[PDB]
């Protein structure tokens, strides 16, 4: 067949982009100690083929963690533009989803989803590294449920 | 025949480099008290292929852009040709000098990358790393020029018949303590990996090529040590045994590199160049003079077939 | 009740023995080798890692996460 | 032998032209000097190994070392020039005509 | 524990052991049970070209003996 | 022919890798650096002079080779020590 | 006393130079001492990288032998007796 | 594989020609590296293994490295590229055509002099010691340690002085 093996090929390339995940840990504030605790032994981010840290130009995922102010927004959008396609994003914390306890302040971006798009959301102040892993696995699944080759071969 | 042998020499070494990336991850994890990759496949024997597919999937002067990584990788692969295991693919007198040349060249790639990237930021680190690499390759060459006087020939086969009885470490260990270090600079490994420590232009593909060549050079310098200073057993009926012991000692050195990368901090550039210029070069010259005198105030002046 | 760190109880000596130990530790790298030994120790230990979806960390009844209204 | 030798001499002449004519730089001149030196070392080693002579081989080594040092001092001068003017151009040296 | 690295250690071991024995056995298959001769000098090359000329086949992996 | 084969093979393999990469998806001066490069030269030249010992040693004028080696090494070390004392290995600007 | 103090200082402050200079001295000095030095030149003279062209006997030279295996020539037995 | 030396020779010619037609230095240094490579290969084909490897190790690794180093750290390829490279490329093409036709002209007047084309492969090695060890350039270059010591001491002094000269210059 053709469509069968095309679906299988898409599933395999998704296997790749699902295992070889490299983050840029844009952790501004106290939603960062938890990323570090996660890459720590007891949960071992790397175990899932997910390196502790790495530069953007070779990265795939981008973890936002912390209040997103009006002086560190530009830099963030710059990084998300510099990064190479595909580029997946993960918001990690109240401050970065809805401005958290600083929503009604004057020097906050009330949601990183205004600056940048998003593929996953995570709640907390802070979250628990376990919930963070669960978000990342939701991301792996949001990957595994893609059909690029199918949509092209029926474009 | 020959194409078969070149395949046997090129495919397995790429396989080993991949699984060496793996072994690095695993040992670093086990020394930092974590596991490491255990998921993508049984005990993590698929993460490397995963990384390959991912990189080749990532989107991005073409001349430099291509010739630099290609050049580096080709040099790193050719470095393997003249090695004895135990009878080599290409027996070359002056083989180790060919090695040194083809190892020094990659500086051209390092430098073209910078001269292309207009980033002053990039030229900064490029110059720094180029200078350290140069300065350490100097001693990497002098050590051989001071040891090989034990076998009056730049070949790489004579090493074996020499070490038949004894090794080359019980003597010359004032050198092995160096040849096991400069190898950590030409490779830009730790504790001299500042070239990747201070960051403020390698895309996915060319990064894969650079890293391939890096770990290839790792394996190869470790093999060179295992051949020079850790002479294996050449019982002519057991080339298999030779290759086997060589494998063992190469793995041992390649795990020592990782002990190091995990344990130690990094060297500040100035402290590093101080280290070289004011600790290794005087010792190196004096020890070379020592090994020059040894075969004169001792009968041990070797032959040249 | 204060203290003193990074200071010798008095002036040192110039003993050939002390200079010898200093020279040795500067050449053969005893302390660095000790660090390598420590890393080896931790290598040969049990890792604290756990499989998350099949093993989940400890807690206490006082947690604070998802919300829930209730009923009689 | 004769063909390759005439071609090497041609290459020497071409480096000569490169040095005797400029294009608003100095590193080009010095690199053409290096090309000269390379051609000469090659022709000398070729002559030696073709005559099977040995005692005459130290000469390429000697002249290669001397060319290395010569180009080194030339680069030092180029650098002083760039650091006292602002670039390595050639048309800045309009002085000394008075 | 530390007994989970063998599935990479043994892999690298075999894939670094293969080239040596490969080369040896291949050279031997070609040159007929005896290893590949080497010529660091013109002497051995003269010997080899002599054996080539007298092989009767124009290949040097043939040692004749006393029956010539 | 053998090295030609090997090198062409390696180059073509690398270029296959890079073509895959491209198809599958679809300043002031620091005098110190120049001084260091110069030291590197003036040492490589010593290396060129010094390599031939494995054949200069099997001659009969040991009283000559021993000497000339000591001479080269010691005078090079003298130049090195002078550079040091005159602060070519300090890096502080 | 000043020398002794300086060396007792250097042997903790900067040994590298001490080791280097001691090695240098040993190298320059031992060749003048050891007895096994000349033997090297003797060996490398013995080693026949070329052919020993013979001569005639139109005279009364009694030193040179009429045969290799004869004893009338220069011996080197000390080589194996070494 | 008979035209070997002639090919290497023409390529060295072309490298020196690309240096004489002064291009942008970044695209001239490649010509120089090619020139050195091909010249060393010629030496090797003749039989100077030691000399060729000495070149690879010193010329390239020692001199071209520092040339690029100094160039980058002390030069800027200002926008003098008004298609200058694209012009001198066609100029180089015209020159190489001139040279090809020049040799095809010469071969008529001169046959056993400038170049012997019908028998080009011949006339590279003239004699050789078939049964002789110790006939490689290693011995000639080692001479300096037994005879011709003047060469070694002179080079030593050249370096001993070049150090002082460079340092006293840079200040
Ligand atoms: C006849 C024979 C004559 C007698 C000779 C005796 C033995 C000679 C020993 C030769 C080796 C000398 C190496 C050496 O001297 O290293 C010194 C170096 C310190 O140098 P420095 O930069 O000045 O900093 C020290 C400040 N206190 O130390 C260092 O800082 C180097 C740090 C190295 C980091 C890498 C560690 C790798 C450890 C691997 C061990 C090998 C397995
Ligand atoms: S949500 Fe809470 S834990 Fe996270 S960055 Fe904001 S204040 Fe810190």
UniProtKB/TrEMBL annotation, chain H:
Its main location: mitochondrion. It is found in: Mitochondrion membrane. It is a multi-pass membrane protein. Residues 1-18 form the signal peptide. Its EC number is 7.1.1.2. It catalyses: a ubiquinone + NADH + 5 H(+)(in) = a ubiquinol + NAD(+) + 4 H(+)(out). The chain crosses the membrane at residues 36-66, 86-109, 142-167. Pfam families: Oxidored_q3 (PF00499). One of its GO terms (molecular function) is oxidoreductase activity. One of its GO terms (cellular component) is mitochondrial membrane. Keywords: Electron transport, Membrane, Mitochondrion, NAD, Oxidoreductase, Respiratory chain, Signal, Translocase, Transmembrane, Transmembrane helix, Transport, Ubiquinone. Core subunit of the mitochondrial membrane respiratory chain NADH dehydrogenase (Complex I) which catalyzes electron transfer from NADH through the respiratory chain, using ubiquinone as an electron acceptor. Essential for the catalytic activity and assembly of complex I. Belongs to the complex I subunit 6 family. This is NADH-ubiquinone oxidoreductase chain 6. It comes from Mus musculus. The gene is ND6.
